Amino acid sequence: SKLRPEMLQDLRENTEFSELELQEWYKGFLKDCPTGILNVDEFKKIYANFFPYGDASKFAEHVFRTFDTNSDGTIDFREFIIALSVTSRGRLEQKLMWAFSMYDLDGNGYISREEMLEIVQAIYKMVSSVMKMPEDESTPEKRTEKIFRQMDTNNDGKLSLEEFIRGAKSDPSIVRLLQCDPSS
Ligand SMILES: [Ca+2]
Ligand SMILES: [Ca+2]
Ligand SMILES: [Ca+2]
């Protein structure tokens, strides 16, 4: 019912959750996923709460690939909570590291254009029914077109991690966030 003391400490180190929150998350996790393992179909049902199932499905699949760090087809409680912790309470630097690890489809250390386009397409499909887009990045190809041509510094047609991180920071939602840096 409850995390072992040895387990608990490993997760306090690798997440930004308190012990109480970890115990509460674990209980609730087993509550909702009795096997102790989340598979892809389950993960799609989670996303389907927030956006329509069919639409959200391909994005969900990519997220799952990334959460599933050992890459076996399921997510244990550890992979879940660590992924949750990073994405929801991580440093900005390490959020983008994780986002990069998602876009780099074949895990070679570079995002190719066709890797980018693919993710961007999935985000657009999930969202299509409910958010209405800017004007110039209001099509996956157009967007992928903006991103590369703002982020590919050395022009090899690939994004390195450092290119990725630097460029993301001129996203408006980051430009906003950064105005809240408590270093004033
Ligand atoms: Ca796994
Ligand atoms: Ca790649
Ligand atoms: Ca490059």
Author numbering: 6 to 189
Can you list sentences taken from the study reporting this PDB entry?
HPCA or hippocalcin, is a member of the neuronal calcium sensor (NCS) protein family and is highly expressed in hippocampal pyramidal CA1 neurons, in particular in their dendrites. It contains four EF-hands out of which only three are capable of binding calcium. In response to increased intracellular calcium, hippocalcin undergoes a conformational change and translocates from the cytosol to cellular membranes through a Ca2+/myristoyl switch mechanism. The extrusion of the myristoyl-containing hydrophobic N-terminus region from the hydrophobic pocket allows hippocalcin to localize to membranes where it can interact with downstream targets.
Mutations at positions T71N and A190T were shown to be critical in development of DYT2 dystonia. The crystal structure of hippocalcin(T71N) and hippocalcin(A190T) did not show any significant conformation difference when compared to the wild-type protein and they have identical crystal packing. Mutation A190T is located at the end of the flexible C-terminal helix, which is predicted to interact with hippocalcin target protein. Change from Ala to Thr does not decrease C-terminus flexibility.This part has no electron density in chain A. As expected, hippocalcin(A190T) presented similar calcium-binding properties to the wild-type protein with Kd = 77 ± 5 nM and n = 1.3 ± 0.1. Oligomerisation upon calcium binding was also observed for the disease-causing mutants hippocalcin(T71N) and hippocalcin(A190T). However, the mutations significantly decreased the oligomer formation when compared to the wild-type protein. Hippocalcin(A190T) showed increased binding to both channels compared to the wild-type protein, suggesting that the mutation in the C-terminus region is important for target interaction, as previously shown for other NCS proteins. For the dystonia-causing mutants hippocalcin(T71N) and hippocalcin(A190T), calcium influx upon stimulation significantly increased to 51% and 62%, respectively, compared to hippocalcin wild-type. For both hippocalcin and hippocalcin(A190T), fluorescence calcium signal decreased by ∼60% in the presence of ω-conotoxin MVIIC and ∼50% in the presence of ω-conotoxin GVIA. These results suggest that the increased calcium response due to hippocalcin(A190T) expression was predominantly due to calcium entry through N-type calcium channels.
